[PDB]
Amino acid sequence: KVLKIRYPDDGEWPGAPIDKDGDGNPEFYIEINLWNILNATGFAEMTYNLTSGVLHYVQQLDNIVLRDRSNWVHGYPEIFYGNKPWNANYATDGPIPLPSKVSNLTDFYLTISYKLEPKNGLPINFAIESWLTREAWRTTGINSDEQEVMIWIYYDGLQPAGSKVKEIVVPIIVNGTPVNATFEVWKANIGWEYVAFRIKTPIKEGTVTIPYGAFISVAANISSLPNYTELYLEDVEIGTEFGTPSTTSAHLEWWITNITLTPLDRPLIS
């Protein structure tokens, strides 16, 4: 009834599938993913109650030393659907067939219900991301002719990599009300092409629906990559990047109660 993963008890890379029907194909996959922490005191723990579908993350880290300061953030505790291309973890029990080529995929709404509670001014975002790869089922990382796309619906004290390109409007739904929101578009080259959409009005808690293709279409349009529409949208990851090279203590709690992907009858890219 309750799935729990914990750092450092379960090792430096705790993770587990959510597979409510026990059929061997996870609906989602969770990782604590403190990918840039070399050492810290304290703990991080993620629990999923299968019996309510609440995911609850609790982190209390101190004495943090990073693997590589140039990577800026400390980690990205997360839940994801599809194939995460950095490792052998996946979740494909859902209505959207990921991975799929972007030229073949339908648009979809992504709806998330959540609440964030960073403590003491910790820099954080709440960021949705996808990786776009040349192969269908990548498990060994990311090359220079591929893309990372992020959508930050909350932030405090973090800036995306690279430089600001533009602002766009995206129709979204916030707490049941359709609203026109503005996102800054940022682009970087960090070993691969990075495009981030940072909302200008951060949303710290509630229920938010976004149309995924509004973001992928812009990321395609601004891309310097050849043959963009032949890339595969590998996954949809949801989590909180946190920390900066100056941050030595990072206390954070958050909850996600629902993630739903809803197919639309229209192409992803327009």
CB of 194 to Ca ion, least distance (A): 32
Q: How far are the Cα atoms of 49, 136, 200, 226 from residue 170, in angstroms, in the given order?
A: 33, 28, 11, 26
Q: Which of residues 233-262 bind Ca ion (CB under 5 A)?
A: none
In sequence order, the β-bridge partners of residue 174 are: 177, 208
Residue of minimal Cβ distance to Ca ion: 93
CB of 17 to Ca ion, least distance (A): 8
Q: Please identify, using beta-carbon distances, which residue of 92 and 100 lies nearer to Ca ion.
A: 92
How many residues of this chain bind Ca ion (CB under 5 A)? 5
Selected range binding Ca ion among 90-98, 110-118, 242-250, 252-260, rule: CB under 5 A: 90-98
Q: Please identify, using beta-carbon distances, which residue of 21 and 265 lies nearer to Ca ion.
A: 21
Residue entry with tokens 């060994």: 140
- 87-91 LR contacts (CB < 8 Å, sep 24+): 87/139, 88/139, 89/15, 89/17, 89/29, 89/31, 90/26, 90/29, 91/17, 91/18, 91/25, 91/26, 91/27, 91/28, 91/29
Q: Please identify, using beta-carbon distances, which residue of 73 and 79 lies nearer to Ca ion.
A: 79
Q: Please identify, using beta-carbon distances, which residue of 89 and 147 lies nearer to Ca ion.
A: 89
CB of 50 to Ca ion, least distance (A): 11
Q: Please identify, using beta-carbon distances, which residue of 44 and 91 lies nearer to Ca ion.
A: 91
CB of 28 to Ca ion, least distance (A): 10
Q: Which of 137, 25, 24 is nearest to 86 (CA)?
A: 137
Q: Please identify, using beta-carbon distances, which residue of 92 and 159 lies nearer to Ca ion.
A: 92
Q: Residues 6 or more apart from 111 whose CB is under 8 A from it?
A: 173, 207, 208, 209, 258, 259, 260, 262
Residue ranges for the binding site?
19, 21, 23, 25, 27, 83-84, 87, 89, 93, 249
93 lies in the site for Ca ion, by CB under 5 A: yes
CB of 84 to Ca ion, least distance (A): 17
The interface mask with Ca ion, positions 1-40, x = CB under 5 A, is: ------------------x-x-x-x---------------
Residue ranges for the binding site for Ca(2+)?
19, 21, 23, 25, 27, 83-84, 87, 89, 93, 249
CB of 110 to Ca ion, least distance (A): 20
In the chain, DSSP assigns E strands to 2-7, 15-18, 28-31, 37-49, 54-66, 78-83, 90-91, 100-101, 106-118, 124-133, 147-156, 163-174, 177-189, 193-199, 205-211, 232-233, 235-239, 250-267
Residues that bind Ca ion (CB under 5 A): 19, 21, 23, 25, 93
